[PDB]
Design a protein around this ligand. Structure first.
Ligand SMILES: CCn1c(NC(C)=O)nc2ccccc21
Ligand SMILES: [Zn+2]
Length: 140
């Protein structure tokens, strides 16, 4: 589990969005596994605006933050998980590391701020849904 809290936006994995998220929906995209809802209180996170390929992510199933190198966001085939069938996911970055389903929502961060959230795992990789292209998260 986990979210990004930037201004009055909550960014969550679409597959973990709650009824309150859907009832307060700003934007969602199944192909990216992202959903954005509105918040009362302003959030503590800053979104990265950059093309970094190194950062640190939180792994809840290890209670650990790991430094990783990761691929640039792209359209990738993802094998079946507990929460999605085998399918193509867009805006996905991969790193070598540990990721189980419950790790979804952990933040990947670089020197510029939050890059994305854990969205995929299995076969010794961790996949992250990028948010750095969502420039509208920083305004209105
Ligand atoms: C995102 C703001 N921010 C953070 N934040 C964290 C969590 O590390 N570290 C910074 C270092 C220098 C300048 C700004 C910085
Ligand atoms: Zn960066």
């Amino acid at each position: 589990s986990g979210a990004i809290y930037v201004g009055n936006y909550r960014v969550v994995n679409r597959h973990l969005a709650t009824h309150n998220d859907w009832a307060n929906l700003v934007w969602e995209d199944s192909s990216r596994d992202l959903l954005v809802s509105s918040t009362t209180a302003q959030g503590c996170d800053t979104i990265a605006r950059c093309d970094c390929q190194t950062g640190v992510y939180y792994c809840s199933s290890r209670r650990k933050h790991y430094p990783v190198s990761f691929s640039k966001p792209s359209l990738i085939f993802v094998e079946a998980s507990e929460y999605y069938p085998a399918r193509y996911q867009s805006h996905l970055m991969l790193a070598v590391g540990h990721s189980e389903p419950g790790d979804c929502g952990g933040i990947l961060r670089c020197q510029h701020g939050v890059v994305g959230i854990v969205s995929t795992g299995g076969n010794g990789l961790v996949g992250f849904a990028d948010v750095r292209d969502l420039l509208w998260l920083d305004e209105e």
